[PDB]
């Protein structure tokens, strides 16, 4: 309904093990070369509201249970969340993303470009 | 918010292959030996609205992408969604389930007494 009704823009949802990959996609967001401001970015914390939440969905997000349970919560209630696939084979990928929008993280910056551009898409929708 | 909202109170959600035991399933909850009425049960189809959503998760619905979007479907917003899980190994069983309510297929009547207990549950908070 309004950009300012949330603290903050994006959220990166991730595993312990894909702390770094989080971080420079974080710095990706928020560094760049009707609230007409730059991408508020920040690090997926508890209670921790944002507009766009952004999971990492990386090999070790699927071998934690906890992170799939997340990435449920995530796409329950239309909404901003745009899943990224990196570091793992499109036969590997979950089945549900078939019939669902995903960034793959073998396209342009490592699917960091696609994600911001998706960031951006759903801003304009906002007050 | 009512009972009467909805024209049925259970959907049957399952794969192609398990159409037999979710025939059995329907059977069970409508056939028993402020609305004060029976249970009103269907097998799930396109645009069906029902209280509750009875997902009968088997190796066949695993198998297939589209069944698993839909359990996705049916999880996005409080609500009744009772997964029973019949015909596979408990290690075997989506990692999801861990942090959420389901019913054991290992149980009483195959599972088919806890889930018609879990929908008799729901009625009750019904106008």
Do not use: N
């Not at 595993?15 to 508020?40: F, K, M, N, R, W």
């Not at 745009?82 to 549900?96: F, N, T, V």
């Amino acid at each position: 309904s309004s950009r300012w009704s949330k603290d903050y823009d994006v959220c990166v949802c991730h595993s312990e093990e894909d702390l770094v990959a989080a971080q420079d996609l974080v710095s990706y967001l928020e560094g760049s070369t009707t609230p007409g401001g730059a991408i508020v970015s920040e690090l997926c914390q508890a209670l921790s509201s944002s507009h766009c939440r952004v999971l990492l969905i990386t090999p070790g997000f699927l071998q934690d249970p906890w992170c799939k349970y997340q990435m449920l919560q995530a796409l329950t209630e239309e909404g901003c969340t745009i899943p990224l696939l990196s570091g793992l084979s499109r036969a590997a990928y979950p089945p549900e993303l078939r019939f669902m929008y995903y960034v793959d993280g073998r396209g342009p910056d490592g699917g960091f470009r696609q994600v911001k551009e998706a960031v951006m898409r759903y801003l304009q929708t906002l007050s």
